[PDB]
Design a binder for these strands. Sequence first.
DNA 1: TTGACTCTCTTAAGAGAGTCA
DNA 2: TTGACTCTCTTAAGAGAGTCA
Lengths: 162, 162
Amino acid sequence: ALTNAQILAVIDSWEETVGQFPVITHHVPLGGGLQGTLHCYEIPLAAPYGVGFAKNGPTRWQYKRTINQVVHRWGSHTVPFLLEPDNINGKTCTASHLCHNTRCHNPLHLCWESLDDNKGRNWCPGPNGGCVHAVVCLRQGPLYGPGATVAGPQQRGSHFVV
Amino acid sequence: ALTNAQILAVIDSWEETVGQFPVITHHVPLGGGLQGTLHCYEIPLAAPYGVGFAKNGPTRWQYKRTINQVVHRWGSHTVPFLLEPDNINGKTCTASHLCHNTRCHNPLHLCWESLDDNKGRNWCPGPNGGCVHAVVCLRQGPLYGPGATVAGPQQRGSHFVV
DNA sequence: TTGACTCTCTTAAGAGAGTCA
DNA sequence: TTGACTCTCTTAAGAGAGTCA
Ligand SMILES: [Mg+2]
Ligand SMILES: [Mg+2]
Ligand SMILES: [Zn+2]
Ligand SMILES: [Zn+2]
Ligand SMILES: [Zn+2]
Ligand SMILES: [Zn+2]
């Protein structure tokens, strides 16, 4: 809600509830042929999810609290960042999973960045493979690799140059 | 159904027409601090675009040919790939700009790959910066770099471990 | 047969808000 | 007040199809 105290109280309640989510260990590629381990705090697959939490989509949740007799609601991963600017360079800030695990609500696996920065982590080579993200990746992106391109650049005639 | 010969004729007419589009020289990052040059064949900003071409969205066009009294229509960048498989790994193939210039219709700047592979090129370090795409990038992706993350991973209490 | 418009849809990373009990 | 559902929306890489003359 409006006050900094009220916002801190929301973050604190969220952390306490998410802190009781099951901790699931995931071994992950780091890049450079190395492997690491992440501990994701995973929201349950079905209700009940935790005090204040409800599912609005297959992989979407919201956190809600009643403050000053009014319901305040947020996307479930946005709560750690309620004191941060909600835009950057005219682009909306989004909660971005460094662990690429949507059910995870571990704030140590989240950052707050444009949707383009968020998406791009999917292809990052990872913290031991050349990640240049200033807020460093925790793992190689799941889509990193050579791809599966069916056909490359080509022409039949002689009208084009690269 | 259109025969192989008829499809080749469509591709040839498309190439003839696109080859007469304005050719614009662009200096581009290649990765590794190097600069290169791409020559884009750019569809006009407003009608007329060229024989067979029409705009269906702000940066979307279609190519249309009428063969034996039947109207056939294709997305304007898909025509080079009409003799190729149209899916791979259960994913639809998409025209993918290696030059990242949507108006460009140079077939030497296009490849044919899944939408995920397509998107990922936006963040590629480039052919001189570590590109691992099997069909190599022509330039560093426009969104490559450290990003502009507003807030990184953080907690207020001690409920979490990474 | 052709041009120049019109409309809505897909995907996978993210969102806000309403209906009931 | 809290829980458990419902719906549609945003973005930026990409699509198919209709109307009229
Ligand atoms: Mg993400
Ligand atoms: Mg692209
Ligand atoms: Zn996680
Ligand atoms: Zn990274
Ligand atoms: Zn081009
Ligand atoms: Zn590449």
